Enzyme design. Sequence first.
Site, PDB file in Angstrom:
ATOM      1  N   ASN A   8      -1.107  -0.548  -5.182  1.00 13.46           N
ATOM      2  CA  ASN A   8      -2.117  -0.568  -4.141  1.00 13.46           C
ATOM      3  C   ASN A   8      -2.170   0.825  -3.505  1.00 13.46           C
ATOM      4  OD1 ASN A   8      -2.830  -1.405  -0.947  1.00 13.46           O
ATOM      5  ND2 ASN A   8      -3.870  -2.637  -2.507  1.00 13.46           N
ATOM      6  N   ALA A  50      -1.284  -7.057  11.475  1.00  9.48           N
ATOM      7  CA  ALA A  50      -1.754  -5.711  11.775  1.00  9.48           C
ATOM      8  C   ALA A  50      -0.554  -4.801  11.570  1.00  9.48           C
ATOM      9  CB  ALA A  50      -2.296  -5.613  13.205  1.00  9.48           C
ATOM     10  N   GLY A  77      -1.045 -14.473  -1.582  1.00  7.31           N
ATOM     11  CA  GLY A  77      -0.443 -13.707  -0.512  1.00  7.31           C
ATOM     12  C   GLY A  77       0.370 -14.468   0.505  1.00  7.31           C
ATOM     13  N   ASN A 125      -9.967  -8.878   0.797  1.00  9.33           N
ATOM     14  CA  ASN A 125      -8.935  -8.438   1.727  1.00  9.33           C
ATOM     15  C   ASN A 125      -9.201  -9.373   2.913  1.00  9.33           C
ATOM     16  OD1 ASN A 125      -7.050  -6.834   3.396  1.00  9.33           O
ATOM     17  ND2 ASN A 125      -7.506  -5.153   1.986  1.00  9.33           N
ATOM     18  N   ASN A 164      -7.414   0.346  -2.266  1.00 11.35           N
ATOM     19  CA  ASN A 164      -7.558  -0.372  -1.020  1.00 11.35           C
ATOM     20  C   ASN A 164      -8.534   0.346  -0.100  1.00 11.35           C
ATOM     21  OD1 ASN A 164      -7.374  -1.804   1.286  1.00 11.35           O
ATOM     22  ND2 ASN A 164      -5.178  -1.462   1.617  1.00 11.35           N
ATOM     23  N   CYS A 175      -8.773  -2.005   4.347  1.00  9.46           N
ATOM     24  CA  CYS A 175      -7.855  -2.368   5.447  1.00  9.46           C
ATOM     25  C   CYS A 175      -8.661  -2.627   6.735  1.00  9.46           C
ATOM     26  CB  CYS A 175      -6.799  -1.289   5.690  1.00  9.46           C
ATOM     27  SG  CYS A 175      -5.591  -1.778   6.936  1.00  9.46           S
ATOM     28  N   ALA A 232       0.810  -1.214   0.000  1.00 12.70           N
ATOM     29  CA  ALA A 232       0.000   0.000   0.000  1.00 12.70           C
ATOM     30  C   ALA A 232       0.849   1.273   0.000  1.00 12.70           C
ATOM     31  CB  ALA A 232      -0.921   0.010   1.223  1.00 12.70           C
TER      32      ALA A 232
HETATM   33  C1  LIG Z   1       1.380  -9.133   5.935  1.00  9.63           C
HETATM   34  C2  LIG Z   1       0.205  -8.739   5.106  1.00  9.63           C
HETATM   35  C3  LIG Z   1       0.116  -7.430   4.670  1.00  9.63           C
HETATM   36  C4  LIG Z   1      -0.915  -7.070   3.804  1.00  9.63           C
HETATM   37  N1  LIG Z   1      -0.970  -5.756   3.394  1.00  9.63           N
HETATM   38  C5  LIG Z   1      -1.949  -5.429   2.470  1.00  9.63           C
HETATM   39  C6  LIG Z   1      -1.782  -4.143   1.826  1.00  9.63           C
HETATM   40  O1  LIG Z   1      -0.822  -3.365   1.843  1.00  9.63           O
HETATM   41  N2  LIG Z   1      -2.827  -3.776   1.020  1.00  9.63           N
HETATM   42  C7  LIG Z   1      -3.837  -4.586   0.619  1.00  9.63           C
HETATM   43  O2  LIG Z   1      -4.631  -4.267  -0.241  1.00  9.63           O
HETATM   44  N3  LIG Z   1      -3.845  -5.833   1.211  1.00  9.63           N
HETATM   45  C8  LIG Z   1      -2.935  -6.353   2.075  1.00  9.63           C
HETATM   46  N4  LIG Z   1      -2.889  -7.639   2.488  1.00  9.63           N
HETATM   47  C9  LIG Z   1      -3.925  -8.444   2.282  1.00  9.63           C
HETATM   48  C10 LIG Z   1      -3.896  -9.067   0.922  1.00  9.63           C
HETATM   49  O3  LIG Z   1      -2.924  -8.819  -0.020  1.00  9.63           O
HETATM   50  C11 LIG Z   1      -4.598 -10.304   0.604  1.00  9.63           C
HETATM   51  O4  LIG Z   1      -5.931  -9.924   0.273  1.00  9.63           O
HETATM   52  C12 LIG Z   1      -4.601 -11.510   1.464  1.00  9.63           C
HETATM   53  O5  LIG Z   1      -4.243 -11.465   2.808  1.00  9.63           O
HETATM   54  C13 LIG Z   1      -5.722 -12.448   1.263  1.00  9.63           C
HETATM   55  O6  LIG Z   1      -5.064 -13.440   0.448  1.00  9.63           O
HETATM   56  P1  LIG Z   1      -3.975 -14.516   1.048  1.00  9.63           P
HETATM   57  O7  LIG Z   1      -4.791 -15.463   1.841  1.00  9.63           O
HETATM   58  O8  LIG Z   1      -3.428 -15.149  -0.147  1.00  9.63           O
HETATM   59  O9  LIG Z   1      -3.036 -13.787   1.838  1.00  9.63           O
HETATM   60  C14 LIG Z   1      -1.876  -8.003   3.403  1.00  9.63           C
HETATM   61  C15 LIG Z   1      -1.768  -9.331   3.872  1.00  9.63           C
HETATM   62  C16 LIG Z   1      -0.745  -9.695   4.700  1.00  9.63           C
HETATM   63  C17 LIG Z   1      -0.705 -11.109   5.166  1.00  9.63           C
HETATM   64  O1  LIG Z   2      -1.000  -3.004   6.250  1.00  9.44           O
HETATM   65  C1  LIG Z   2      -1.821  -3.742   6.844  1.00  9.44           C
HETATM   66  O2  LIG Z   2      -1.844  -3.990   8.066  1.00  9.44           O
HETATM   67  C2  LIG Z   2      -2.902  -4.400   5.989  1.00  9.44           C
HETATM   68  C3  LIG Z   2      -3.573  -3.712   5.041  1.00  9.44           C
HETATM   69  C4  LIG Z   2      -4.656  -4.342   4.325  1.00  9.44           C
HETATM   70  O3  LIG Z   2      -5.253  -3.820   3.409  1.00  9.44           O
HETATM   71  N1  LIG Z   2      -4.986  -5.611   4.760  1.00  9.44           N
HETATM   72  C5  LIG Z   2      -4.289  -6.356   5.684  1.00  9.44           C
HETATM   73  O4  LIG Z   2      -4.628  -7.504   5.987  1.00  9.44           O
HETATM   74  N2  LIG Z   2      -3.185  -5.732   6.231  1.00  9.44           N
END
Ligand SMILES: Cc1cc2nc3c(=O)[nH]c(=O)nc-3n(C[C@@H](O)[C@H](O)[C@@H](O)COP(=O)(O)O)c2cc1C
Ligand SMILES: O=C(O)c1cc(=O)[nH]c(=O)[nH]1
Lengths: 261, 261, 305, 305
Positions: free
Chosen positions: C102, C71, C264, C191, C130, C133, C47
Amino acid sequence: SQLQEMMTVVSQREVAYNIFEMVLKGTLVDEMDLPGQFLHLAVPNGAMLLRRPISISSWDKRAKTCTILYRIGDETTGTYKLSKLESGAKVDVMGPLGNGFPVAEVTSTDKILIIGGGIGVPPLYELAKQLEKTGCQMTILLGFASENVKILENEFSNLKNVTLKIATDDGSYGTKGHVGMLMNEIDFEVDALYTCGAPAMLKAVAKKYDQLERLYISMESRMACGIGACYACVEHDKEDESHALKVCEDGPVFLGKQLSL
Amino acid sequence: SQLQEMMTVVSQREVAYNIFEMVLKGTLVDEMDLPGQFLHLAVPNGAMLLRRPISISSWDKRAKTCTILYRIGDETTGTYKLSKLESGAKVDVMGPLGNGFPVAEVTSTDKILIIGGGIGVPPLYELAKQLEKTGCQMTILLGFASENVKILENEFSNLKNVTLKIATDDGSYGTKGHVGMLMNEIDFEVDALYTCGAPAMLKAVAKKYDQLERLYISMESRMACGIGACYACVEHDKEDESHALKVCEDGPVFLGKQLSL
Amino acid sequence: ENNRLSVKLPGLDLKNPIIPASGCFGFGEEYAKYYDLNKLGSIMVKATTLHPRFGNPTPRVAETASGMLNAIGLQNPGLEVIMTEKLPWLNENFPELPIIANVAGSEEADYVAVCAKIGDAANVKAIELNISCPNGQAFGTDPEVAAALVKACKAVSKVPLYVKLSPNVTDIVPIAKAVEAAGADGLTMINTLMGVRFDLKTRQPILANITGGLSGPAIKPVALKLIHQVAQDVDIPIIGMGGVANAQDVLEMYMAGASAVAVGTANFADPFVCPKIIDKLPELMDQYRIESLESLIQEVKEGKK
Amino acid sequence: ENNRLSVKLPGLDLKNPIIPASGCFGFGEEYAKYYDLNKLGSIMVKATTLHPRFGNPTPRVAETASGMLNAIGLQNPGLEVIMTEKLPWLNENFPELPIIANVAGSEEADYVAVCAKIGDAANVKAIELNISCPNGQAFGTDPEVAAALVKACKAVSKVPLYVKLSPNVTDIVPIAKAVEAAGADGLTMINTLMGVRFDLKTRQPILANITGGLSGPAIKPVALKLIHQVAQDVDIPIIGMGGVANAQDVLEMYMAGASAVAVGTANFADPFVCPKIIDKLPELMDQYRIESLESLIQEVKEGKK
Ligand SMILES: Cc1cc2nc3c(=O)[nH]c(=O)nc-3n(C[C@@H](O)[C@H](O)[C@@H](O)COP(=O)(O)O)c2cc1C
Ligand SMILES: O=C(O)c1cc(=O)[nH]c(=O)[nH]1
Ligand SMILES: Cc1cc2nc3c(=O)[nH]c(=O)nc-3n(C[C@H](O)[C@H](O)[C@H](O)COP(=O)(O)OP(=O)(O)OC[C@H]3O[C@@H](n4cnc5c(N)ncnc54)[C@H](O)[C@@H]3O)c2cc1C
Ligand SMILES: Cc1cc2nc3c(=O)[nH]c(=O)nc-3n(C[C@H](O)[C@H](O)[C@H](O)COP(=O)(O)OP(=O)(O)OC[C@H]3O[C@@H](n4cnc5c(N)ncnc54)[C@H](O)[C@@H]3O)c2cc1C
Ligand SMILES: Cc1cc2nc3c(=O)[nH]c(=O)nc-3n(C[C@@H](O)[C@H](O)[C@@H](O)COP(=O)(O)O)c2cc1C
Ligand SMILES: O=C(O)c1cc(=O)[nH]c(=O)[nH]1
Ligand code: FES
Ligand code: FES
């Protein structure tokens, strides 16, 4: 190839109360050169996806093995499931990882102080082994909660030009108390310090030797990716306002005070 | 005690294309007496909580073992992970479960017909072994998709007073086609029928022998609890309007037509 | 790559549908050490916010059954640094790798500022808004509010706008429709869900933020439910994510209605998970009678009602 | 049992806080073969409806990572049969086992009819209003609607009324408050989240119902989040459920704010899971400085803000 490998378990024995010593064999040992680096191990359970970060305690170049000492939790933890592994079992490993301890930049005429405690003691063993090959004075101060937990004494005292002092909070063996007591006794002029242990202990060490330039602290944090991409294991640089330091990539080990890279 | 046990794997070999034969050893074998009963096995993966229901193919009373034949899927299935088990490995087992085939209520002067196909064939082996100990005629008609999948032939033909006929859809070995073709050829007057296989095959059998009183059909369904509490594995009784039958408790085997208990 | 894996999405000409999810790949620097990032269809970087952000206090992560909580708190070096260092690095080493940026923020004006600028980067081919969050969201739970935002950002974006939905709602359908009518070129979902873990010794939540976002295989069924639900009445493409860990999952997302797939959490368990999926994909397609993913999309699309 | 495990909840004098969850224990007949049901604090039997119900077509279950999906469709033999056969069976064999009756329906009048009758059963000590069946819910997503129902049923119930909440909402707080103000004696949560699984060969959803409810360890973090969220501003007890598989989980529910704990899906994996938890509980309490669960409840309650 050089980043991940299905290493083989040579042996696994319990060496102290709930502390296991596992000896792994694999080519990854070749990339090892710095002490304090860690291995990111995968738990033999599909429901536990997060790899556990455990420091390398020592490695044998010729035998192509590495040894890690780690504490286990109850039936629901991954370390517990890790400790059940027998000889020949495979362990998914990611490593070496992280910035290790700066060793080959010290003279053969310096007074070295190595302070350790609990599960922070293991990486400090390879540190001494590497410094013994160089030359000068080493005074290791190791602290433990109880004798029941005490580890690596036999091999630490089995090192030349080393002066070992053990301390124990309650379950007494050496000098009764915390490592802070031992720090008070030392007379000589220290030129470098290496620490790894509980945050409370690291705070005492950094406070007492506030302006010691070569103060190296090996840190711990909750990790996920282990390579610096997730931003989970973050810490503050020279004061809140500055850069954000990742304990998995910039660390484990950093410079003095309440963190400087 | 008598409901669940950590059985030991005596052996595990692949006997046909992606079909394994596992021999288990444990006290649970003592409770076995009826053919067609099943075992609810737990997958060696904490992320896969649902036990897989597999019928008992045969058991050795004196040797205290039981044998199950099962098909595996790809890397992501539980049966796949089950097939990786070596000799000495433990398997969490729940069983015997379900209502088996009614055997000790037939004369030594009856004409028995046993129809099978694919993975429905295994439980029918213990059925013949139990009926051989009684006496009269047994004509087993087994169908398979291909010879590559064909199982238990050597031991089926190794039975006395048994007439075995094999059929294969495409990968031909015996009579080319489906079991429906074999059903058409039989002349003698059948007094009892036992079937276990694909829903399509079970439909053909129940349709052809619509008013055969002793028509036993062993059914399959998606299960969870395996004891009759979750109500997952449900089927309709004598027509939609009536009782709801659970394939795990009331079944696997039921009475004739499109289900009667 | 090969033709059977290529998909055409607005602003995105992907060689294969495998895209690392935002926040799980940083800005590509770390994983580049592991493998050639060019093997990927695209990357969803972390992001970006108008102003640099440190994030939430630690601990920032926790483990759950078949999933994890996070978080992070949207930590990123800010737009300026991302425009001058992060994006240029990717453009210098991997000029042909299309990237999805993002975008996040605390208010409409923040989103607007980023969307208007980030598109200047030559390698940024699409924006992923996004508005979701967990721990974002105060914008993803109301249709009219989400729509207002999307409309404003769409008016200022030079590249296609994809909107990231939240699964933490009673009914996602109205939100999806509203966002589509407001001008969104596509959707990405989902998300994370919200969860908490307590430390038995301290009796306190493990995360400093108390609550966190739940991701991993554990949430796959929920992701599929939502994607399927939304696909039945939206005319724009959906890039699905949530618990994908292998090629089978990728195919399952397609059956649900996704056009491309993001991965992810799996990267944490296995850093080579993406290249592996890409390699195993053609074999799996063979086995399930799939000639090309492009044909699969259309087939799933017409097999509606 | 012993004093350290006993909890007093409205209408429920439990010897220990372990209660099998509704739909996972039938009416106790099957599991009675496995162990003495008297080892349990109470039992939450399958949903009872005014008229007998067959349920949804099969398949009714599917497996997911650390969880499972179900779409039974509220199958039950009806009130009449439950009043004359099911409940009496439990009262004849286990006279001292307090049971919690789960009530469901398609409309207010249906809920009302069951609540007014089911309390006559000597062994039924409390009612669990199921306003949350996934696949119930059309009553658990609106505060005013839920409240209206709760008020009506409360006016006709002879035993305490506990209300089962749904996690499939944007904000559970307003729903909880409304239900409390309407007269509910306590709350139980959570029911299942919604999910879907697709069969790669058929390209169709595995469940005949398409969607199903997701349960198991996978949903524990979500259950804790919600329980914790609701506990911060409700003055009535909460019986928590969602992914409990061992004694540690039971204790985690307590830290979140629950007073008693229900175990559902785990029974399928291990039929002795409940007795095991009950046996391991005292050792675990010793280790974490807990004298009694009654003291733990109060401690967690005052350690608020
Ligand atoms: C450590 C972490 C940080 C994330 N940060 C973001 C983020 O910057 N922006 C966003 O749109 N989603 C963020 N995500 C959430 C996703 O990219 C994603 O939707 C995901 O967690 C769900 O798919 P997954 O099960 O393959 O992780 C984050 C997930 C994790 C685990
Ligand atoms: O940066 C984070 O904590 C974050 C952002 C987001 O969109 N989703 C998530 O699971 N983590
Ligand atoms: C760089 C580094 C080096 C380490 N070296 C060692 C070592 O040499 N010997 C040793 O015994 N321990 C070491 N630790 C601590 C060790 O990683 C944790 O004790 C262990 O990961 C806890 O896992 P668990 O099996 O108990 O799992 P669980 O408690 O079930 O927890 C699951 C998740 O929580 C994480 N986690 C839980 N507690 C901690 C904690 N205190 N610190 C970090 N992660 C935690 C786990 O890693 C995992 O991702 C190190 C930690 C770091 C960051
Ligand atoms: C009473 C009974 C007896 C059986 N006996 C045998 C036997 O002797 N030999 C044999 O090879 N097979 C038998 N089966 C079928 C076997 O249970 C399934 O093929 C197997 O459970 C599929 O599990 P999986 O390891 O592939 O897992 P996955 O495909 O990953 O699926 C996970 C979940 O789906 C369930 N599931 C998936 N497909 C099926 C299916 N077709 N039928 C039932 N459950 C399914 C699994 O049991 C499990 O709970 C029997 C089924 C029943 C109901
Ligand atoms: C097979 C099955 C049937 C269920 N039927 C009901 C039901 O009758 N009524 C109800 O209130 N909840 C029902 N539940 C849901 C719960 O009892 C419970 O909230 C649970 O799924 C969440 O906890 P768990 O993870 O321990 O299962 C059912 C769950 C399952 C798995
Ligand atoms: O009977 C069902 O299908 C059912 C009811 C309910 O309340 N929740 C659930 O997950 N299943
Ligand atoms: S473990 Fe991911 S950035 Fe350190
Ligand atoms: S498997 Fe639960 S009722 Fe049959």
